[PDB]
């Protein structure tokens, strides 16, 4: 996933080419998750994907707080 995005200069592999997506999928089959899921609850291809998993819960409770206080 590095060199298919480094030789193609694809900075983020959701901007990966459609043949360049599936040819990697023909090589390594566990990557159907981070490339072909509509709304994965964990963010695909980010460093803080576990951290952005947490900060939503911090957000979504405050609106559940803030619209309940009203």
């Amino acid at each position: 996933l590095t060199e298919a995005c480094a030789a193609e200069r694809v900075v983020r592999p959701h901007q990966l080419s459609p043949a360049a997506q599936t040819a990697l999928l023909r090589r390594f089959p566990a990557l159907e998750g981070p490339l072909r899921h509509p709304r994965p609850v964990l963010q695909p291809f980010d460093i803080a994907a576990e951290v952005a998993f947490v900060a939503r819960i911090q957000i979504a409770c405050l609106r559940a707080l803030g619209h309940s206080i009203r």
């Binding site: 590095t2 060199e3 995005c5 480094a6 200069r9 694809v10 900075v11 983020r12 460093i47």
Partner: protein
Amino acid sequence: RSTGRSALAVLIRACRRIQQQLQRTRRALFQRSNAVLTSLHHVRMLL
């Protein structure tokens, strides 16, 4: 003949095996830095 030429079979093979490693030092030293060329572009691929 086994003194004059046999002082030269010493020194024909001597140069013709120094020159052969120099083909292999081109190849075994950038396929370690092409992985460096992979990772250094991968730092902005994180970004």
